[PDB]
């Protein structure tokens, strides 16, 4: 359970690179 | 219009594949109506539903154990990672070495996630626990 | 801080959700693979490697920085070394060499303890070529000199 | 291959536009933060040979994680069936052309590498080997069958038959 929260946190951080853009 | 399988007079069994590298036809229309399908004037229409067209298929030890080991090869307010950058520092002891990276692995494959960062008396608190 | 190459050699050598996401990623490895390939003047060449606890993923982590009058210089003393040894000199490589049913090659065991061949270099005569004599041929050359290159 | 290879120049610099600015993005600094990975120092062909047993894992990972049976799949990266298929195992052995496109990129990778592995056993000269990594670039559409799983990958071959020619 935490290893899938870990790359969801890394797949979250790749999308802080074009978050308030993107939306 | 559609003709069944009773309006094809004489289909026979499909015993065998194949022969001398040769492809064996089962002698039945029971691929083709599954394919496709008849008219009633003996035409032949396809199906056509192949979406990801897929172009090659077109053309063919107890924990405990594991514990004790590891209080064995851990002196005290060191980690286990740190215990593998100094006897891997050709390195001073590779057999002590490839047994520490051994037992880190068969605790990994347990389900214990991390065991690299982990101190000696917090190993021995799980030992005692 | 780094590791030992023992550690990851016993690792890749005896081998499930933390390990299915993490080779996602392969094609980004294979690029990293292969744009770090080795100069035909360099023998072996050293890079970092970031890997898996299980052995799931392993990339090159270094971008190729080359400076670029020393980089044509040293192609053109390729081509002149490779006319003088085709008008010298063949026997083209054997295409895929290992078959397909056998395993690749374990490095431990036949390529850790044998010496590499010798390398394609040009003569560089000491009298004229006096100022790039001592560092032509290396695999980031002037990088530990103060002088030339800002740092490491 | 002069006209072509300037018609291709002519497009890059036709087509040219400033990248979008963004923040700054970096990869393994974030991986390297997840406890998950670690880090070392090896050679080039112990990571080279590392990769492509990786890559051979994940597809045969990908091959038996529907139950597959019927298929094999060679080190040098040829993936054959066994038998004569039925009409429900081709629906089964449905999968997409990303599978076989970066099953040959990984045999174009094996290439590469087996011949550095060949050089550094002493078979094979230095002199050779620049001949045989000038070949596979250049031949990457005659060795692998990866023009049939991407199209437009036929303007990549030819800009390197057409490199083959001047030089």
Same mark, same amino acid.
């Not at chain 3, 980031?140 to 490491?152: A, E, F, T």
């Not at chain 4, 089964?92 to 550094?120: I, M, P, W």
């Given at each position: 359970?935490?290893?899938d929260?870990?790359?969801a946190?890394?797949?979250?951080?790749?999308?802080?690179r074009?978050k308030?853009?993107?939306e | 219009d559609?003709?069944?399988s009773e309006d094809?007079?004489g289909?026979?069994?499909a015993?065998?594949?194949s022969?001398?590298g040769?492809?064996?036809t089962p002698?039945?229309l029971?691929?083709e109506?599954?394919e496709?399908?008849?008219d009633?004037?003996?035409?032949?229409?396809?199906?056509r539903?192949?979406?990801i067209r897929?172009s090659?298929?077109?053309?063919?030890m107890?924990?405990?154990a594991?514990?004790e080991?590891?209080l064995?090869l851990?002196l005290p307010?060191?980690?286990?990672?740190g215990?593998?950058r100094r006897?891997?520092?050709?390195?001073?002891?590779?057999?002590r070495?490839d047994?520490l990276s051994?037992l880190?692995?068969?605790?990994?494959?347990?389900?214990?996630?991390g065991?690299?960062?982990?101190?000696?008396?917090?190993l021995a608190?799980?030992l005692?626990? | 801080?780094?590791?030992?190459?023992?550690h990851v050699?016993?690792?890749?050598?005896?081998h499930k959700?933390?390990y299915?996401?993490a080779?996602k990623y392969?094609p980004?490895?294979?690029?990293?693979l292969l744009? #770090?390939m080795?100069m035909?003047?360099?023998q072996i060449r050293?890079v970092p490697?970031?890997?898996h606890i299980?052995?799931?993923?392993?990339?090159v #982590?270094?971008?190729?920085?080359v400076?670029?009058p020393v980089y044509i210089?040293?192609?053109?003393?390729?081509?002149?070394?490779?006319r003088?040894?085709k008008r010298d000199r063949?026997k083209?490589m054997?295409?895929?060499?290992f078959?397909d049913?056998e395993?690749?090659?374990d490095?431990a065991? #036949?390529?850790?303890?044998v010496?590499?061949?010798?390398?394609?270099?040009?003569?560089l005569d000491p009298?004229e070529?006096?100022?790039?004599l001592?560092?032509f041929?290396?695999?980031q050359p002037?990088?530990?000199?103060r002088?030339?290159?800002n740092?490491? | 291959?002069?006209?072509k290879?300037?018609?291709?120049?002519?497009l890059?610099?036709?087509?040219?536009?400033?990248?979008?600015?963004?923040?700054?993005?970096?990869?393994f600094?974030?991986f390297?933060?997840?406890?998950?990975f670690?880090?070392?120092?090896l050679d080039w062909?112990?990571?080279g040979?590392?990769?492509?047993?990786?890559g051979?894992?994940m597809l045969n990972?990908?091959i038996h994680?529907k139950?597959?049976?019927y298929?094999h799949l060679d080190?040098?990266?040829?993936?054959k069936?066994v038998?004569?298929?039925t009409?429900?195992?081709?629906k089964?052995?449905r999968?997409?052309?990303?599978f076989?496109?970066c099953?040959?990129?990984?045999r174009l990778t094996?290439?590469?590498?087996?011949?550095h592995?060949q050089?550094?056993?002493?078979?094979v000269?230095?002199?050779?080997?620049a001949?045989?990594?000038?070949?596979?670039?250049a031949?990457?559409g005659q060795?692998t069958?990866?023009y049939?799983?991407?199209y437009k990958l036929?303007?990549?071959?030819?800009?390197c038959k057409?490199?083959?020619?001047?030089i």
């Amino acid at each position: 359970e935490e290893a899938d929260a870990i790359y969801a946190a890394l797949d979250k951080r790749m999308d802080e690179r074009r978050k308030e853009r993107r939306e | 219009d559609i003709l069944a399988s009773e309006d094809v007079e004489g289909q026979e069994a499909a015993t065998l594949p194949s022969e001398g590298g040769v492809r064996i036809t089962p002698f039945n229309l029971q691929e083709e109506m599954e394919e496709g399908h008849f008219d009633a004037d003996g035409n032949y229409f396809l199906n056509r539903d192949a979406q990801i067209r897929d172009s090659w298929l077109d053309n063919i030890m107890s924990a405990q154990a594991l514990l004790e080991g590891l209080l064995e090869l851990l002196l005290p307010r060191e980690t286990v990672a740190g215990a593998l950058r100094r006897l891997g520092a050709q390195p001073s002891s590779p057999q002590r070495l490839d047994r520490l990276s051994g037992l880190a692995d068969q605790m990994v494959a347990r389900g214990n996630l991390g065991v690299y960062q982990e101190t000696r008396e917090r190993l021995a608190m799980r030992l005692k626990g | 801080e780094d590791m030992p190459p023992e550690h990851v050699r016993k690792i890749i050598r005896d081998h499930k959700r933390v390990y299915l996401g993490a080779l996602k990623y392969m094609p980004h490895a294979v690029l990293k693979l292969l744009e #770090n390939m080795p100069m035909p003047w360099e023998q072996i060449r050293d890079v970092p490697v970031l890997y898996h606890i299980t052995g799931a993923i392993s990339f090159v #982590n270094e971008i190729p920085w080359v400076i670029e009058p020393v980089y044509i210089s040293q192609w053109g003393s390729m081509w002149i070394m490779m006319r003088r040894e085709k008008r010298d000199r063949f026997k083209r490589m054997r295409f895929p060499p290992f078959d397909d049913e056998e395993p690749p090659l374990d490095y431990a065991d #036949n390529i850790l303890d044998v010496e590499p061949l010798e390398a394609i270099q040009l003569e560089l005569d000491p009298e004229e070529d006096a100022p790039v004599l001592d560092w032509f041929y290396d695999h980031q050359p002037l990088r530990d000199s103060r002088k030339y290159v800002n740092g490491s | 291959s002069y006209q072509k290879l300037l018609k291709y120049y002519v497009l890059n610099a036709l087509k040219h536009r400033p990248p979008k600015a963004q923040k700054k993005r970096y990869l393994f600094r974030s991986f390297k933060a997840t406890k998950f990975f670690q880090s070392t120092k090896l050679d080039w062909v112990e990571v080279g040979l590392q990769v492509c047993r990786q890559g051979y894992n994940m597809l045969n990972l990908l091959i038996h994680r529907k139950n597959l049976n019927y298929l094999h799949l060679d080190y040098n990266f040829n993936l054959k069936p066994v038998k004569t298929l039925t009409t429900k195992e081709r629906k089964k052995s449905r999968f997409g052309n990303a599978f076989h496109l970066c099953r040959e990129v990984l045999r174009l990778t094996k290439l590469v590498v087996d011949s550095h592995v060949q050089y550094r056993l002493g078979n094979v000269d230095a002199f050779q080997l620049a001949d045989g990594l000038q070949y596979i670039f250049a031949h990457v559409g005659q060795l692998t069958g990866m023009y049939r799983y991407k199209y437009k990958l036929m303007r990549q071959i030819r800009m390197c038959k057409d490199l083959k020619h001047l030089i």
